[PDB]
Design a protein around this ligand. Structure first.
Ligand SMILES: NC(=O)C1=CN([C@@H]2O[C@H](COP(=O)(O)OP(=O)(O)OC[C@H]3O[C@@H](n4cnc5c(N)ncnc54)[C@H](O)[C@@H]3O)[C@@H](O)[C@H]2O)C=CC1
Length: 442
């Protein structure tokens, strides 16, 4: 697409009932986006089922969960977990006794990594082994799930998977320079992406963040057909990131965190949804706002995009509850610092020529720059130092609100989706949150 495809109106329809089955295709963590959606599924009375990625033994081989592990995971999910290790990516896959891609990274150093070259034939061999492992896993899971979804049921498959970062020591050093580095410690995104290391990482990102959705859609085809033929409905959702419209100069304008390294994989995810949609499959990627979760915590500055949600809460027919949210955010700031000052510093940030330059949709994701690093990391740091405690942040409050709002948006839109790719920006999320709280006054 050449511009965002916004969802503007709060959806009101629902087809899901007791007996219908919600499948979490990913693991549920605290602060995770999926919390919003799964709670909706739970309150609609759906049967909750999920997958596990399994665990690694110390021979670094994949294993299913133990009884104890499974019980814990199932209590955390609030439903059954199918005990098959559905770990995506190929960074730890290889033919028996041969190096993994991770092994091939083992002798890269801080001095050598930009120029180190990889045996791409071997990496391709590993990719094939890993991909076939994941497909075989998906077939296992779908075989078991098929027996759990009766004829006539509706099924909701919710994809959440994103990742593919290799567990090697050199990369997090490189990462701290790319994501947090200023001045002489700045390292451009391009430096990583042009290296063989970066190329490998991007291949893994495509596998985990994008191709897993395709494997979900293909792997569940028999179930889909049987349900569709027996009066059921089937839906697929995925969490996308492709920038977000936020209030800049009292207008909702698309912007993004830069540089979003998963960007190529997220656009491949979108393409998978579009291809499936043309085949009559109801698959939708929901491009959701920047928040702080386990997967985005490292992206220092990503959270700068979230603060103007406060202004959206007021703009979208905010009343007493929105005012209470402002009060809540005021309370975590140190005496002498006002929420107004915080928000003005964010408006100043988006007003800057440097930041205005990154509002280029067609160029997304753009490479970062030293100027970007200085203003983004500087601003993020300043705002964090406005807080009473660095463990109680305005962004904690606001990230929880976005979970809460995107939940019903995705759950209800999936009953009758407008298209294969939809943006949930601050406008529609604020509308949803104010509407949910229309009875909470004072
Ligand atoms: N946090 C943010 O700012 C945004 C996140 N998203 C997307 O939301 C989705 C959920 O992520 P978050 O809630 O942010 O964090 P999270 O850490 O709670 O979720 C990550 C999910 O990816 C799964 N995952 C990671 N590696 C995997 C692997 N090798 N194999 C199989 N599954 C794997 C995890 O089980 C988990 O379900 C992701 O796709 C993310 O890209 C979308 C927009 C913004």
């Amino acid at each position: 697409m050449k511009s965002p495809i916004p969802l503007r109106d709060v959806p009101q329809s629902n087809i899901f009932r007791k007996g219908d089955v919600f499948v979490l295709f990913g693991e549920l963590f605290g602060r995770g986006y999926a919390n919003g959606l799964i709670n909706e599924a739970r309150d609609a009375g759906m049967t909750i089922v999920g997958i596990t990625v399994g665990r690694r033994d110390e021979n670094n081989a994949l294993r299913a969960l133990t009884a104890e592990e499974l019980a814990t995971a199932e209590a955390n999910l609030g439903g059954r977990i199918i005990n098959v290790p559905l770990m995506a990516g190929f960074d730890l896959d290889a033919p028996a006794g041969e190096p993994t891609p991770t092994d091939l990274l083992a002798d890269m150093t801080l001095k050598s990594w930009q120029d180190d070259k990889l045996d791409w034939a071997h990496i391709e061999k590993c990719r094939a082994v890993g991909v076939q492992r994941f497909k075989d896993g998906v077939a296992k899971v779908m075989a078991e799930l098929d027996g759990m979804i009766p004829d006539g049921a509706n099924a909701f498959f919710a994809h959440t998977m994103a990742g593919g970062i290799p567990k090697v020591k050199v990369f997090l050093a490189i990462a701290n320079r790319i994501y947090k580095g200023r001045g002489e410690r700045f390292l451009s995104s391009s430096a990583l992406l042009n290296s063989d290391l970066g190329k490998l990482i991007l291949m893994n990102f495509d596998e985990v963040t994008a191709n897993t959705f395709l494997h979900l859609i293909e792997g569940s085809a028999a179930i889909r057909a049987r349900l569709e033929k027996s009066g059921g409905q089937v839906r697929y959702s995925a969490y996308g990131y492709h920038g977000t419209e936020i209030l800049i100069d009292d207008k909702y304008q698309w912007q993004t965190y830069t540089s979003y390294t998963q960007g190529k994989a997220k656009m491949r995810l979108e393409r998978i949804a579009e291809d499936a949609w043309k085949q009559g499959i109801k698959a939708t990627v929901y491009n959701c706002p920047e928040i702080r979760t386990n997967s985005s915590d490292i992206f220092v500055g990503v959270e700068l995009s979230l603060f103007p949600l406060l202004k959206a809460l007021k703009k979208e027919n905010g009343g007493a509850w929105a005012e209470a949210q402002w009060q809540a955010c005021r309370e975590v700031l140190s005496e002498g610092h006002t929420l107004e000052s915080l928000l003005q510093k964010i408006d100043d940030y988006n007003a800057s020529d440097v930041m205005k330059g990154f509002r280029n949709f067609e160029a997304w994701p753009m490479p970062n720059t030293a100027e970007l690093a200085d203003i983004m990391i500087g601003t993020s740091d300043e705002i964090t130092k406005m807080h009473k405690s660095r463990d109680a942040l305005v962004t904690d409050v606001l990230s929880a609100l976005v979970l809460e709002g995107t939940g019903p948006l995705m759950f209800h839109e999936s009953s009758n989706p407008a298209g294969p790719v939809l943006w949930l920006s601050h406008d529609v999320i604020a509308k949803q949150l104010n509407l949910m709280h229309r009875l909470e006054h004072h």
